[PDB]
Design a protein around this ligand. Structure first.
Ligand SMILES: CS(=O)(=O)c1sc(OC2CCCCC2)c2c1[C@H](O)C(F)(F)C2
Lengths: 107, 110
């Protein structure tokens, strides 16, 4: 029950794996270009922004965040996004965040 | 004219036994494989014989450390030959669920 997503430091979806349709309902074309914060519960938006800003400072370590994502079926799904920044060591291009997004329980 | 570093970078996902559970469509332009023909197969089946022991050590390290950077290694291409790769591997645990791989083909492509 998971999909891979690639983001810019701002949180914009720059790559989405097709398994997102099962997970949240949207086709990859409906998420690309959009920011991940746009699909987030208003109570979790700041936390998700602070996690994206901190995962940059953590030198490639994994940082996990739990938040509510509005699915295409108009439901708040509990997501666990595990993320890390990747920078190709042969270059000095800006780092991009790589995420694993899974629908988990809050019990 | 050749491909750049981003164009030669693909993502792959594996279960803890090295099996492919996901691969980015970009691997077709680089190595020739199709993500569906890799699913269920072990990553180990693709390493060059001379790079086998090093990748075993990298996997053992990855399992204990949580993240690893492989050395330069060779992967068998679809129509014979071997390309040189360098991968950054990261284990996704449940605070192990899977291994995420950011793979970069060092070899000169297109
Ligand atoms: C983190 S690593 O040791 O660099 C590493 S490279 C790799 O597979 C290659 C990825 C690119 C296409 C050919 C196969 C794998 C690992 C882990 O041991 C794994 F289990 F996830 C499987």
């Amino acid at each position: 029950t998971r999909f891979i997503s690639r983001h810019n430091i701002e949180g914009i979806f720059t790559f989405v794996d097709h398994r997102c349709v099962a997970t949240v309902g949207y086709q990859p074309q409906e998420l690309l270009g959009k920011n991940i914060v746009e699909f987030c519960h208003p109570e979790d938006q700041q936390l998700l922004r602070d996690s994206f800003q901190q995962v940059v400072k953590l030198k490639g370590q994994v940082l996990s965040v739990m938040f509510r994502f509005r699915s295409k079926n108009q439901e708040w799904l509990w997501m666990r996004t595990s993320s890390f920044t990747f920078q190709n060591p042969y270059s000095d291009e800006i780092e991009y965040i790589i995420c694993t997004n899974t629908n988990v329980k809050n019990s | 004219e050749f491909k750049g570093l981003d164009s030669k970078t693909f993502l792959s996902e594996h279960s803890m036994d090295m099996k492919f559970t996901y691969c980015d469509d970009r691997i077709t332009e680089l190595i020739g494989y199709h993500p569906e023909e890799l699913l269920g197969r072990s990553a180990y089946e693709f390493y060059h014989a001379l790079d086998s022991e090093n990748m075993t050590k990298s996997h053992q390290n990855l399992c204990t450390k949580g993240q690893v950077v492989s050395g330069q290694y060779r992967m068998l291409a679809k129509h014979g030959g071997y390309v040189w790769l360098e991968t950054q591997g990261t284990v996704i645990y449940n605070p192990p669920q899977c291994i995420m791989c950011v793979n970069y083909v060092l070899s000169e492509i297109e």
